[PDB]
């Protein structure tokens, strides 16, 4: 109940800077219509939008974390169709995703929406820590299935590895909350609710690789 | 215990509605730049400032609740004012919202922001699951006041209703459409905290007709 409330407080705090900045751009546009170059007027509108996206990210992230607390209806579903949907949606010209999915359907018992979120957070984390390369793959063993994401980032040592699931940041870099940390903490909790486990390591290209195991019926 | 959750969900969830509207205004500027004149461009910007206030309002309400312990400070306000506010915000040049409000004002004991949130949720759904037609109406009765929103969508089959008021529960029909399964859950809680009642039904055109009744005290 309460680790959540504290977290909600952080979210509202982190929202202040983006929000103030939007009102600000909004206000100059409002007053400077006669005045402004179309180039600049566009750069305010563009920056507004970048900021709105920042907000939606944190809010969504929190809601997802919230949902993690409650029990969800499980069903049989194809892991590769879920991954496919998320990869399309996180798929951008900004970032190119390498798809290397197991070439057969994988049935696992899951709440699809929850899985979609776990995948999505892994992707954005891999887009932050990484240098642009992201690879999503899946596969299966007799007893358990898996999906994983990989970046060409710095590659996190087993020491820092533990303090990677922390939503709150020690430094107070003017931000109460780590999006990266909260994200992975969300993933951690979703995998657990599915009776799976996470497994971290180095990728093909030296970066981070996080893999999520799930039970097959 | 379960309740504290839906409070928190309600805050973050309801923050998105105004932000989203912003993305709509920002983009139209970003694209329409050559074309647009003062009068409208000035309006778009004003709309962004309104909606950013709304975000702070929502944030403020939560912080107050943290110090006060009291979440929805009640008071006598004009229901219609709040309705008109939401009708204005949510209708653009693209989208037009029909109106059958009660003439004059309706004084009700409410927490105006919270109701504004409720009405918003109802109206974004009417857009989300409807086919463009949306009608907001209000009226009053001997001891009660009401507002409803109506869409021309498929409505909600009575068998489904109780199921869909639960938090984080979406519709299979909804699966197609994006979302969170929270709007109705929130609307209910807000209306409950006002000791009101929700009444679902079929709209003028076969869609959902969702109506909130509020008590009007008597000296
Ligand atoms: N106006 C409507 N017409 C038809 N169906 C509706 C309407 N409003 C809600 N529904 C259905 O009721 C379900 C519950 O909606 P709700 O709990 O409001 O969250 P949501 O609209 O799914 N997502 P969100 O608003 O983003 O949290 C939806 O998934 C729809 O199937
Ligand atoms: Mg809704």
Curated annotation (Swiss-Prot), chain A:
Disulfide bridge map: none
Cellular compartments annotated: Cell inner membrane
Effect of residue 13 to V: Does not autophosphorylate, does not transfer phosphate to OmpR, increased expression of ompC, decreased expression of OmpF
Region feature Cytoplasmic dimerization domain (CDD), when dimerized forms osmosensitive core, mapped onto this chain: 1-67
Subunit note: Homodimer. Interacts with MzrA.
Function field: Member of the two-component regulatory system EnvZ/OmpR involved in osmoregulation (particularly of genes ompF and ompC) as well as other genes. EnvZ functions as a membrane-associated protein kinase that phosphorylates OmpR in response to environmental signals; at low osmolarity OmpR activates ompF transcription, while at high osmolarity it represses ompF and activates ompC transcription. Also dephosphorylates OmpR in the presence of ATP.
Note from the entry: Cross talk between this and the Che and Ntr two-component systems can occur at least in vitro.
Domain notes: The periplasmic domain interacts with MzrA. The periplasmic domain assumes a PDC sensor fold. The HAMP domain by itself is intrinsically disordered. The cytoplasmic dimerization domain (CDD, residues 223-289) forms an osmosensitive core; increasing osmolarity stabilizes this segment, enhancing its autophosphorylation rate and consequently, downstream phosphotransfer to OmpR and signaling. The autophosphorylation activity of the CDD is inhibited by the angucycline antibiotic waldiomycin which probably binds to it.
Name of the featured protein: Sensor histidine kinase EnvZ
Organism whose genome encodes this protein: Escherichia coli (strain K12)
UniProt lineage: Bacteria, Pseudomonadati, Pseudomonadota, Gammaproteobacteria, Enterobacterales
Chain's gene name: envZ
């Amino acid at each position: 109940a309460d680790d959540r409330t504290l977290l909600m407080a952080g979210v509202s705090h982190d929202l202040r800077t983006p929000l103030t900045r939007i009102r600000a751009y909004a206000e100059t546009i409002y007053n400077s219509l006669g005045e402004l170059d179309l180039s600049t007027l566009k750069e305010l509108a563009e920056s507004i939008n970048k900021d709105i996206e920042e907000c939606n990210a944190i809010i969504e992230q929190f809601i997802d974390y919230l949902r993690t607390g409650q029990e969800m209806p499980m069903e049989m579903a194809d892991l590769n169709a879920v991954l496919g949907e998320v990869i399309a949606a996180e798929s951008g010209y900004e970032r190119e995703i390498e798809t290397a999915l197991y070439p057969g359907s994988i049935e696992v018992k899951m709440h699809p929406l929850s899985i979609k979120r776990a995948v999505a957070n892994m992707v954005v984390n891999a887009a932050r820590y990484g240098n642009g390369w992201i690879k999503v793959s899946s596969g299966t063993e007799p007893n358990r299935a898996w999906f994983q994401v990989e970046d060409d980032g710095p590659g996190i040592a087993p020491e820092q590895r533990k303090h990677l699931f922390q939503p709150f940041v020690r430094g107070d870099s003017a931000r109460t909350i780590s999006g990266t940390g909260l994200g992975l903490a969300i993933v951690q909790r979703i995998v657990d609710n599915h009776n799976g486990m996470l497994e971290l390591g180095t990728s093909e290209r030296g970066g981070l690789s996080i893999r999520a195991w799930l039970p097959v019926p």
